[PDB]
Amino acid sequence: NFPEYELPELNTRAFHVGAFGELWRGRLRGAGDLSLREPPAADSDREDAAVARDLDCSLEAAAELRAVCGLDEVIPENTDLVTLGVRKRFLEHREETITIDRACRQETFVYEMESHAIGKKPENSADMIEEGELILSVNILYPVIFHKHKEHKPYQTMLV
DNA sequence: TGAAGAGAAACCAGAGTATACCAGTTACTTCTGTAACTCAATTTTCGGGTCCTAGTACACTGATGG
Numbered sequence: 037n038f039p040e041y042e043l044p045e046l047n048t049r050a051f052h053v054g055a056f057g058e059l060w061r062g063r064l065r066g067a068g069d070l071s072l073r074e075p076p077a078a079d080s081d082r083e084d085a086a087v088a089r090d091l092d093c094s095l096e097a098a099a100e101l102r103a104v105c106g107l108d109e110v111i112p113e114n115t116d117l118v119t120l121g122v123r124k125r126f127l128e129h130r131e132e133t134i135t136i137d138r139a140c141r142q143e144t145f146v147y148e149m150e151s152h153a154i155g156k157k158p159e160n161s162a163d164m165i166e167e168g169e170l171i172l173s174v175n176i177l178y179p180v181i182f183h184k185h186k187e188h189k190p191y192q193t194m195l196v
Numbered sequence: 197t198g199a200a201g202a203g204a205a206a207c208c209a210g211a212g213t214a215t216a217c218c219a220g221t222t223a224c225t226t227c228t229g230t231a232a233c234t235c236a237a238t239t240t241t242c243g244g245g246t247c248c249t250a251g252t253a254c255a256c257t258g259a260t261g262g
Contacts, residue, residue: 141255187245 057170070167172196 037051038059064070084098091098116124130137139147158164175193180186 136257138256141253144255 053170053172057168060170061168064168072165072167 037055039048039051039056042049080102084095084102087093087098087101088095113120113124173193174196175191178185178190178192
């Protein structure tokens with residue numbers, strides 16, 4: 037069944053997870069969007085033929101699209117935008133209020149827990165997961181260990 | 197021919213007299229409870245947040261000294 041907001045922005049209606057995964061794998065069935073492969077002049081011609089086949093255009097038009105839509109750090113930042121200006125001001129104020137300016141232990145902790153296993157390939161390739169496996173991001177609320185854990189409920193999230 | 201009282205025109209306090217409040221009580225009403233459905237207004241209460249100031253842990257930094 038379709039997941040839809042039961043509450044405006046807090047909660048969905050009860051829906052079967054298997055049905056939802058099947059809807060998704062049905063709408064992406066054999067479209068090449070669920071690959072789980074790593075990202076890889078002769079290929080240019082095949083790509084242009086594919087674009088001509090999928091967009092009903094000419095090989096010349098496909099090559100033109102491939103050329104024009106091409107992709108289009110350095111800490112210096114000038115000629116700012118709104119949020120870029122806010123970031124510049126924040127950076128300058130931090131440069132004068134802080135003396136060591138390195139990632140706090142909680143920042144590195146949250147990051148190194150989040151990005152602990154990303155792109156980690158299976159050693160066996162027999163425990164490789166199938167294309168389309170519906171990872172659920174549960175988060176289990178810690179019990180009330182400290183008294184203040186009633187106010188702001190700490191949780192640990194698991195990618196089931 | 198004064199003497200011991202006789203009369204006479206003043207003050208002066210006080211005892212009824214006059215007020216002056218100041219309670220002292222008889223009917224004669226409302227207002228309870230319970231019941232009920234109704235609806236809106238208002239209160240209470242109640243679990244949980246909410247913000248805020250103040251420490252606190254903890255990994256790292258930055259010398260420091262022997």
